[PDB]
Amino acid sequence: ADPQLIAALYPDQAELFLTMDMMDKQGIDPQVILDADRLTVKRSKEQRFEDDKAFESALNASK
């Protein structure tokens, strides 16, 4: 009904809102998210640190 007020008051679980809105509004199966979120490697620090530079440059350099 309001995908905004619900989004705001709870910034902590934006992950759940994203996944649910993937699940229902868009057409993807609630099975193909399950593996990819179960299959993930632990970012172990190293992976995470690199993706994070990566986002940082990319978002900043997109115009």
Partner 1 sequence: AGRLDNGFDVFKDTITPTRWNSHIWTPEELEKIRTEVKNPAYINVVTGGSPENLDDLIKLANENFENDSRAAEAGLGAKLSA
Binding of partner 1 at residue 62 (CB under 8 A)? Answer: no
Give me the phi and psi of 9, to 5 degrees please.
Answer: -55, -20
Residue 35: both structure tokens together: 């593996």
Binding of partner 1 at residue 57 (CB under 8 A)? Answer: yes
Residue 27: both structure tokens together: 């057409």
Contacts of 30 (CB under 8 A, 6+ apart): 23
Considering only 12, 53, 62, 63, the residue that binds partner 1 (CB under 8 A) is 53
Binding segment for partner 1 (CB under 8 A), chosen from 2-10, 18-26, 29-37, 52-60, is: 52-60
Q: Which residues bind partner 1 (CB under 8 A)?
A: 49, 52-53, 56-57, 60
